[PDB]
Every structure is written in C-alpha cells, then in structure tokens.
C-alpha cells in the first residue's frame, strides 16, 4: 500500500482522496500505486475506458467523460470516438 518517495495522500474539505507529488510539485486525483497499463482507446472493449478516464453521469448535464491525464472533459465516449474516427 505505500506511496512512492515524496508523495503524500490528502483529503479535500469533503473528504475526497487526492495525491500530492512533492517530486514535481503537483497534485492529482490519480493514485500512482494504481497506475494501470495504458492502451489506445480504440483497443478498449465494451464498457471499458482507458487508464485515466472516468465516466460521469451528471444529473444536471448528463453523461460526460473526464480524462484525468490531460485534465479534459468531453461528451463523446472516448473509446467510441476513436473507433468511430478510425472508420
């Protein structure tokens, strides 16, 4: 379970976990311990998202997709988008 060297975990005001990287002076939602193998989005399967991505079903705005690596949000499922565009 332990973090890499010069990493701390912390809680937001709400008690949400995030990670502090003192090596690069940055914070992230992504757990460095859980760093999965990445893959081209078009190589994912059904209901599969690539590493870094999170599907948000927002009661106000509806479903959208969050990429924690690029710090981007978008509406299209990124796997379906890559598959679409590769046609």
């Amino acid at each position: 379970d332990p973090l890499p060297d010069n990493w701390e975990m912390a809680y937001t005001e709400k008690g949400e976990v995030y990670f502090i990287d003192h090596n690069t002076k940055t914070t992230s939602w992504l757990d460095p311990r859980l760093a999965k193998k990445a893959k081209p989005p078009e190589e994912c399967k059904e209901n599969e998202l690539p590493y870094g991505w999170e599907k948000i079903d927002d009661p106000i705005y509806g479903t959208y997709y969050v990429d924690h690596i690029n710090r981007r949000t978008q509406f299209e499922n990124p796997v379906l988008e890559a598959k679409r565009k590769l046609q």
């Binding site: 912390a10 502090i20 940055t26 981007r72």
Partner: peptide, 20 residues
Amino acid sequence: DRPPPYVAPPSYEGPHRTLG
C-alpha cells in the same frame, strides 16, 4: 455545448489535509 470544466484537486502550493 461544452461539458462541465475539469475539476482539479487542490493546488500543490498551499495547505493540505495530509491525514493519511
């Protein structure tokens, strides 16, 4: 439209609840 903007964790340069 654009979806909701990316919500980052608290910025590094500041106080953190390091209570782990």
